[PDB]
Amino acid sequence: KNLVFQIGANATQQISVNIEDMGADALGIKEADGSIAALHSVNDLDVTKFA
Amino acid sequence: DNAADCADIGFDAQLKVVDEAIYQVSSQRAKLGAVQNRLEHTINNLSASGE
Secondary structure: OOOOEEOOOOOOOEEOOOOOOOOOOOOOOOOOOOOOOOOOOOOOOOOOOOO | OOOOOOOOOOHHHHHHHHHHHHHHHHHHHHHHHHHHHHHHHHHHHHHHHHO
């Protein structure tokens, strides 16, 4: 579901743009990861969990 | 729904067919100008031969 912009007065004179981020915008491979890589932007350990 | 690759909802086909409509209303409108030229040259023949 790209961001097709119309840019020209003719066919296929267009630009495709994509965008993503949310709470789970930390490290990623295809998905973020489980215990890491999203909750490093949603949960962010230091509740007691560095001592 | 879709961008360019459905042939009945894609921008390229739709716009192309608008360009066809413009092209063939332009064609029909382009015949009849030449028809007016036919009739002007004709009337010149009719005034000459008439005289």
